[PDB]
Design a protein around this ligand. Sequence first.
Ligand SMILES: CCCCCCCCCCC(CCCCCCCCCC)(CO[C@H]1O[C@@H](CO)[C@H](O[C@@H]2O[C@@H](CO)[C@H](O)[C@@H](O)[C@@H]2O)[C@@H](O)[C@@H]1O)CO[C@H]1O[C@@H](CO)[C@H](O[C@@H]2O[C@@H](CO)[C@H](O)[C@@H](O)[C@@H]2O)[C@@H](O)[C@H]1O
Ligand SMILES: CCCCC/C=C/C/C=C\CCCCCCCC(=O)O[C@H](COC(=O)CCCCCCCCCCCCCCC)COP(=O)([O-])OCC[N+](C)(C)C
Lengths: 64, 90, 172, 86, 69, 469, 57, 164
Amino acid sequence: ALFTSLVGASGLGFATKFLSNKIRLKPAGYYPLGYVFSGVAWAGLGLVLHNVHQHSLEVLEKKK
Amino acid sequence: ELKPSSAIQRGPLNKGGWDAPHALHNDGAIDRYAHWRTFYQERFKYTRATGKSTLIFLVAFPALIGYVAYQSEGLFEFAGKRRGESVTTR
Amino acid sequence: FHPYNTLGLATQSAMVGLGAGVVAAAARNSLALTTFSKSGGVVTIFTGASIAYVFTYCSAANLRERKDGWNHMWAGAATGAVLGARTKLVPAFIGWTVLCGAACGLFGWTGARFNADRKASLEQSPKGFVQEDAHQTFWEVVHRRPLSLTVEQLGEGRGINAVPIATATEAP
Amino acid sequence: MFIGTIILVLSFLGFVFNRRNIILAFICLETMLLGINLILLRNSVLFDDISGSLFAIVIIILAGVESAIGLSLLVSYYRLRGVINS
Amino acid sequence: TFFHPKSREDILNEEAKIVQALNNQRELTIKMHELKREEKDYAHSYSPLFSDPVPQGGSIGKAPGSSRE
Amino acid sequence: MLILAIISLITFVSMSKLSDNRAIIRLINIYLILVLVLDSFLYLLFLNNQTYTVMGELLIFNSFTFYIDMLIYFIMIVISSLYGYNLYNNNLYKTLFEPKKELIILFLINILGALLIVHSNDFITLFVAIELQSYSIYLITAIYNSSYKASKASMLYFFMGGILSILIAYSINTYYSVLNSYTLHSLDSLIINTLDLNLILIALSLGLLFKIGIAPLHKWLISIYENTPILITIYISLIPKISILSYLVLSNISINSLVISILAILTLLVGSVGGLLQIKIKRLLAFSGLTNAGYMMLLLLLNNNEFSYLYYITQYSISHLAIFMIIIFSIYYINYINNQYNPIIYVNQLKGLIHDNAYLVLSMAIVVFSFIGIPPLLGFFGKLNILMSILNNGYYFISIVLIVASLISALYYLYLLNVSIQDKNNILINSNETVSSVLSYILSSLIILITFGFIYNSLIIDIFNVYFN
Amino acid sequence: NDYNTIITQDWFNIENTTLLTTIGNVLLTNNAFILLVLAIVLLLGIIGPISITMKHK
Amino acid sequence: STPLVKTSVNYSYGDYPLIDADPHFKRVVGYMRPSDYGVIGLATAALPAGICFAEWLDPVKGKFARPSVKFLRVATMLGFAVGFGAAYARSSLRFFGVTENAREYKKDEAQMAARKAAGLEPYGTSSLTPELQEIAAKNSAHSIAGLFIFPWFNFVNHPYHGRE
Ligand SMILES: CCCCCCCCCCC(CCCCCCCCCC)(CO[C@H]1O[C@@H](CO)[C@H](O[C@@H]2O[C@@H](CO)[C@H](O)[C@@H](O)[C@@H]2O)[C@@H](O)[C@@H]1O)CO[C@H]1O[C@@H](CO)[C@H](O[C@@H]2O[C@@H](CO)[C@H](O)[C@@H](O)[C@@H]2O)[C@@H](O)[C@H]1O
Ligand SMILES: CCCCC/C=C/C/C=C\CCCCCCCC(=O)O[C@H](COC(=O)CCCCCCCCCCCCCCC)COP(=O)([O-])OCC[N+](C)(C)C
């Protein structure tokens, strides 16, 4: 499901932001707008991967 | 001229906790005996006795059990064997 | 199996080992008539390893009339004996013997080759499920094997019988 | 094939067994490239083929730039130490 | 009364569907493995446009008779 | 884009002052990001494994080289960020990490050389690209000329690279003399059966492989890696490995080679065993690189190695970048800076890092256990694919040796974590200083990739089946 | 390699094309890419020595 | 304008019909869609916006300062270059029949028919000899694949366009 992929990729973005805060010796919610930013960016990458994969499946099926 | 940042303030690592009264009266002789027994592997050497025990337990005993177990494989069947019948299959 | 000519092959191995030890000695010299004085006996190392390995390998292969990893195990044992004699200690001699023998036995078991035997490999072999009633080859798989093959390979007993029990013990 | 091969091998042995100087090392590099190129050009002629000579020209140019960069590296190395004791 | 397991037939059907998907994957897997080892056309594998493998050499001293098929 | 960047950058760096170095490098970082994102759609050309010969049959373009190209851009972006941004704003770090004026141009030119090595369809292009990369990498080694060790390193590198380049040129010319050709495309199964090219092709492979430092010619490269500035070592230890290995994988000129088999075995053994007694961080990492180069060398003995090699090279690039970045970050908590080119040198200098930065040690643990190959980290799947390939092709003894070498190298991989989770007496109390946001985010992204890449494995294989079949 | 090669004539070449002209022809048309990459290599041969032998500012 | 070598005819690089295997620079820029100009504009804005945001995230000298005008001018220049490269690539990919190309296909059919009506060559007349035309074709064919590495274009009016 596309929605599930976007949620998952956004979760990866949140994980990256949280790990970045902790690596800076900062509180987990140090700059809460960064969570939104990183989640949006990683959701974009997840969407790109999803579209490429769907196109690949389409091509594989069309040769039948 | 290369020195860590003055911005850093370093304090002690204290582990915290409540120092309990010391309920064991350590015996130095027992501790040394325990340490010797615990790290015996660091000082093991191959001699006549040690080699003898090695060649017994790691070689001779496994060979005996292997001969028994491969010689006797499938040899016996006991379930409900009656008089006159052979309990051996070969 | 037709025999290895142990004498000849061992002689060629002696020659190769002597040359290799010579090359190692020349290198050793360059990196450090004194070349053999300050050799460290490397010429002897090479010569003895060569003669031991080749002679024991051919000897064992000829005696057993087989070619497999066990011959390499024996040959590695001999080579390790040679290399561990240099320690002049019985435990180290035994350790070199047994461990070099084990390592070379593993080597001979895998094929006694560093690269691959391409024709026997899975990528170049018949694989997948076999057809109607064909004999099983090494890499192929079935859904059912013939019971006679089971009885011959595994052996009779321990629940391996020619006929299923219930069939055999059926009354009429 | 003969002159080029021998220049290559003798320059290689000069390079390896150099225990005299680093300039000998530079020179062995250059002369190796020379021998490679001579073999190449003889083969070009024997085949009446232009690809051999084209690669010879490219080697010439690259050996030029390699010499330039190598001497610059040697100078930068010297700037710190004042002397090349090899 | 509190035990409400799924029916035996439903369990068998669901596992059979899973195994069918698994066998489909095995077949696709073996298929791709075979197709990768088949050989492609020169256009697909080397050059789509200019799909002639045959060279034409130099054109200055073009000698009648040098062409050979 | 790369040529245009090089030209513009030469103009600007000529006309800019020494204080503008970091701003210029940020500019190029963003430019490369923009190219990577806007021009990515050219993948579509490679659908069905369509191959294109370009520039009059000098360059070859397929999905494989497109992927290697994208990977090289990603690596360049990460590496340029380390120079374009300050970890900390104190005087010490201005002294520790300052970019030279011409460093960025050298980086871009070496990247161009690597891309031309990857795409090379003809031996003349191969040789010119090899020499371009070799010269640029000599200069990158030598650009920090205040360091005695860096200058000594650049000179040793010049000489060893020159000899290997002469071996390569000799191999190319022998191939010409036998076949009157400069292309491997002229080779066919009939030709390989008819003629014994084994000696020539193995000499060419060996000349290329000794340039990335496979045993028994390793030590000169490990010494160079040890003696260069740390931010230089992060680059010179990676890009040449990628380019040379990718070219060799794409060319497939040593299939079932007995000599490559023996040398790959030897490289595994030396990389695993020799790194055990190391006490310096960068020598430990260089022996790591040697063992991993062995793992990749194994893939040169077989056909259809594209998936395993791409997966392995990608995960290795990520792990290598991440471990170097972690070592870099851990510099802020050491109490002794050894010198201005290599601030931290000995593994024991990390002792007790978990008490200073717990999550830095968490990241360190993750990357180390990726290197060891603990599932479900990326390293495990990389090794799994490699084992699948080599066992499918009957390399049984080499598989046993690979097992043994991974076991042995786990010891000096865990040495780092071991000293890192030990305890230090003087524990950071507080600090106002913030690590730079950008590099911390990049390090975190690498860590999250290593940790959660495996969820995309099946999607990746599905994509692969349509672009490489 | 003791035998002698037969040198034969033919008349198919009407131009005055020598080795230099043919090298120019192939280098500037069939291999223009090699030429431009050599331009980059010479550019390196300029930038590098300046970068390491000169101390800016 | 007679071809010296044989080429594939209407080869499928993708799911869509082939318009031109090696389109001329003027055609590729001439067939560009408003979306491609949007791409150019987006790159031109993005690159200096990128440098400014990067300065925001991690200031070069501790204290935020807007990047100087020299760098911003640089930024616009290089961003336009990236945008134009991307847009050219998109249009060429349309020409190969890799992306959707109905509009471009129709426009090409009309233009070719008009040129044939005028008696002109379908791909124009070249100031080069045919051998140099084949060499220029073999140098420019599919050169867009290396957009990441080097820019190369077709500026030569050759006949090897892969059509009938
Ligand atoms: C977990 C511990 C790991 C250690 C054990 C691994 C060692 C593997 C040994 C097993 C194995 C590879 C199996 C690999 C399977 C997966 C690998 C496992 C993981 C890899 C780590 C290597 O078998 C080797 O055994 C050596 C002897 O030990 C031989 O040594 C050499 O001997 C002399 C040369 O002739 C020289 O004198 C000298 O060169 C050495 O002396 C080698 O020649 C031989 O290849 C067997 O492979 C082969 O087996 C044969 C018949 O079995 C198969 O063909 C069959 O043909 C008919 C009959 O032939 C059958 O009718 C037919 O049905 C079947 O088609 C082959 O298709 C092939 O498959
Ligand atoms: C909006 C544009 C942004 C795209 C920028 C890409 C930058 C690449 C930078 C670094 C490489 C990093 C990881 C590459 C991913 C492989 C893509 C692919 O699928 O690999 C396949 C080939 O599989 C292979 O051989 C094996 C690849 C080995 C990957 C090892 C890591 C696996 C775990 C990574 C998980 C992904 C993170 C997602 C988190 C939400 C090539 O796919 P393709 O050639 O068709 O191009 C993709 C279409 N594209 C151009 C639009 C992006």
